[PDB]
Design a protein around this ligand. Structure first.
Ligand code: ZN
Ligand code: ZN
Lengths: 70, 70
């Protein structure tokens, strides 16, 4: 879960800050196929221009698969 | 390998500029595995606050494989 005092950042780096962790530890899931995004590929989110997609009420990411879909 | 009059810095981004290439095209080898790092691994190296380890005279790096051990 992610509630107060956390505000649920819309940015990957900030999301890790509120979660009290690093981008190397936080593992996000795909919003489309719901697959686990490998930490190595998670860095591509910050490397390229991608925003965090919130599915229902949780922070999700776009995998290398769905990346070309949107 | 790297020789004069190249400056050969310890930072990957600067090395790319000196080599007149990009981080996507630059080829780095592992100091441990002795193999060539993958494009995804090179991105990780540039994402982390790591420096290039010069061994024997060739700019070697540390892939995610050895990186998790340290
Ligand atoms: Zn996906
Ligand atoms: Zn290695």
């Amino acid at each position: 879960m992610f509630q107060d005092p956390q505000e649920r950042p819309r940015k990957l780096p900030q999301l890790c800050t509120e979660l009290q962790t690093t981008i190397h530890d936080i593992i996000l899931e795909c919003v489309y196929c719901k697959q686990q995004l490998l930490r190595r590929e998670v860095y591509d989110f910050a490397f390229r221009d991608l925003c965090i997609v919130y599915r229902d009420g949780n922070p999700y990411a776009v995998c290398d698969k769905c990346l070309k879909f949107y």
